[PDB]
Symmetry: C3
Subunit: 337 residues, 3 copies
């Protein structure tokens, strides 16, 4: 057998202040509960559990609304804390060692990318999501941070981000030409404006319907990593998949990716040999029935396994078992006498 | 932003005598209950609620079976009543103003098309359905009117329709060359005979599998509206979609259209700028679980929004919010000092 | 109308010793309970019920584990019993008469193919499954016979099958070049080794994603029956279909075939005019909710109907009903006076 990645790191980030629905903090445990670790090992990969990042959760009286944003100071404090740990993990392993991150709501992405970009500043980002998550604070109708994580990272958008002192440590590390969306089907108007204005590459479900997922992946990589020179940060919101496949998530949107389409994305990104960080966001075991949570867990595991290099086409055994070395009479041997 | 249709009309038709399962009369309310109106408004479209048509529901003793048909006199009386109102609405708005109609079982289609054809006699019809709904009375095994609505409209079939005095006002206004089916997977034998005999264009799920939905739509329009000269009556039976997507309907048939395929049909028809009337039939909130009804409602809303011109690719904002006119210090401005 | 097959045989095999989960013995009854027979008749086909094969179910004390295998002696005794009956049925009908077989777990396949190959030795096999079912006894982690049925049949694998006296009657009748897989997504490593080593044709879900089901079917037939000269044994594991479509099965694996893709396989194989035996395995009415069992039953019926030649494009009536021979006044006739 052969493997692009022979070892990987696992990191849990139970962020739950990016959106009002409680349960995303149970995200990392939902994956740890599963047979994910067992399965990755059987594929011949050494997965090291790097524990969980403790997010900063201020008391409501310590964190009033600022510019409509909810839990903004918790966000800024958590962001920096994420960035510090991710940077350490990335520099420590600097045939690479991918970081698998499990959220947690998507607001964590500001921290992960920032820390990732501090170790590999030339990275590109593949954002798999039903939503843009690129609302700027004054344009956000909800005030939820999981809908704004990209806006603090994109240089071309900094004249639309309100200055806040606790936000100074969060320096924009992304050019608009380094991001590519796949799976969009619920963009806010101002997101659509910014995405088109600054030429951010995006492939919606409409594009997936007209082009096919195979062409979309090829075009997404062509746009942000044309010669596979750049490290890849793969940000995978679980709600990019259709709700029939992953119902246990906060903002489900019908008409999403099939599990197979999602797997194709991960398999292709994995095969570049350039997967640096994969993050899975918006898992919420407190939403839906037990069967719903089981379905969502199952989809998450298959997706993450795909990122680490698992092939549906099969894997060769690390040692071939021969029947005669075990001194056992085979049927072929019996009739030969 | 730009819009093909800037205003539209909403009309409810709670027909429930076209089929034995009670609940389709709650169809229009299921859509009114939803956020459909709110969402259409946010897309920049003025939706006017034109109320509901009161269908004629005779007492069983007033409406005995005739030629196997159930509730035939209720059908004829209701048909004419539908036709009168639809004609008024169409002539009143004669950049068009589309009519959105929500049923109600599919027997209403005889009335809507008749009234529509009275204002726009050169119309073509796109029938999205698992079934032909073109059984002639003596060939119908069930005797349900929702399985015969097209047969009273097609000129080439009038030698197969039993003469009834109360049916005189229902004059065939459709040539067989004006109809195109998409989504068929449960045709009765005599429907298959008539469809092939008179050269009615039809694309079954088999065709969708072998050609892809994109080619099917193009071929369907090519067959009945080759140069986008004709107004389009879009008759959308909800059971055309797969039961996994829309379970709350009377005659569900496995192996149907995905939500995405259905959306593609509506998006393309909408983009012709020729959508005159869109009708959605066979919603039944009294079938299946609450989650089933929620799923069916959700699918209906996304479909109808697609007809009115909603793009999954995003919509531009009607006014761009600038951070400096609001007199707020942006991060870009702060560092520039 | 026209029909490739005008008559067919139905045979139930309630095998339940190939896997630990009880309920697959209720498989044949689940199909008999359905409207399958009624529907096949309406398509104009004479289905003869050939009853059920009574599988051999030894007492645990009579059937200890041998080489890790569970219920191996029950397997060998049952296999021979299956083979004897299938051979009789095949020679008896030797425009062919297809055998429709309903399991029962997939361990029955050793018996059916053996008996089938005894009447038509030049047959090819189309294996539709999430799994290879080609584990050799010493390589099997589970020791379940439903995971090994193919290994006893493939000549190239006989040096990997442990000699057992009760297994002598089971002679390998298949060359590796006569088998083609469709739908694989959960191969064991040693299966992957054997499949690639001996050049067995296989198309995984990855292949289905990149090629499309239409190309996969064409390539599968090209590999094992290039000129439609060989009779076809179609072995269809229900878990080849996605769990959303067929949840009531023992080893469900996400990311499977849609119902439409499965139907395409059956429709194409049927259209060769070379369908000799179709078997449906792994139905288990004791797994999942009532709605789950209903969904699984429904999928099974549509699949089997497709094998017998049912077209979603419609069937012509065996006698056209004219309105005037019945002495009834048509609307066309009324206005003509
Ligand atoms: N426009 C919405 C987008 S929410 C999407 C959140 B997510 O992608 O993380 O699930 C908002 O600003 O809250
Ligand atoms: N052959 C059936 C067709 S029923 C289809 C009804 B509908 O398309 O409206 O759900 C019949 O005549 O009742
Ligand atoms: N590797 C597994 C495969 S089980 C597949 C069983 B079946 O295809 O019949 O559902 C085993 O040896 O038990
Ligand atoms: Mn999202
Ligand atoms: Mn997100
Ligand atoms: Mn229908
Ligand atoms: Mn209909
Ligand atoms: Mn299987
Ligand atoms: Mn199997």
């Amino acid at each position: 057998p052969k493997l692009l990645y022979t070892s990987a790191n696992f990191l849990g980030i139970p962020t739950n202040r990016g959106q009002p629905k409680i349960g995303t903090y149970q995200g990392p445990e939902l994956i740890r509960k599963s047979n994910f670790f067992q399965l990755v090992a059987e594929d011949g990969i050494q997965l090291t559990d790097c524990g969980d990042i403790i997010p900063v959760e201020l008391n409501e009286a310590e964190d009033p609304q600022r510019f409509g944003m909810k839990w903004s100071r918790s966000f800024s404090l958590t962001t920096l804390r994420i960035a510090e740990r991710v940077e350490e993990l990335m520099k420590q392993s600097n045939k690479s060692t991918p970081l698998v991150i499990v959220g947690g709501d998507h607001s964590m992405a500001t921290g992960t990318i920032l820390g990732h970009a501090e170790a590999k500043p030339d990275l590109c980002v593949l954002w798999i999501d039903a939503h843009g998550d690129i609302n700027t604070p004054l344009n956000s109708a909800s005030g939820n941070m999981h809908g704004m994580p990209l806006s603090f990272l994109v240089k071309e958008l900094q004249d639309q981000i309100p200055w806040l002192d606790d936000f100074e440590g969060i320096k924009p590390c992304l050019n608009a030409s380094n991001i590519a969306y796949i799976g969009l089907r619920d963009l806010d108007a101002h997101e659509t404006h910014d995405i088109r204005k600054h030429g951010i590459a995006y492939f919606t479900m409409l594009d997936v319907d007209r082009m096919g997922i195979e062409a979309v992946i090829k075009e997404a990589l062509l746009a942000v990593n044309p010669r596979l020179e750049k490290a890849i940060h793969l940000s995978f919101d679980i709600d990019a998949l259709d709700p029939l496949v992953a119902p246990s998530t906060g903002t489900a949107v019908p008409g999403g990716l099939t599990l197979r389409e999602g797997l194709r994305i991960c398999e292709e990104v994995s095969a570049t040999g350039k997967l640096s960080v994969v993050e899975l966001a918006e898992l919420n075991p407190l939403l839906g029935s037990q069967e719903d949570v089981l379905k969502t867990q199952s989809s998450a595991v298959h997706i993450l396994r795909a990122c680490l290099g698992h092939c549906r086409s099969g894997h060769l055994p690390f040692k071939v078992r021969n029947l005669t070395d075990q001194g056992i009479m085979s049927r072929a041997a019996h009739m030969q006498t």
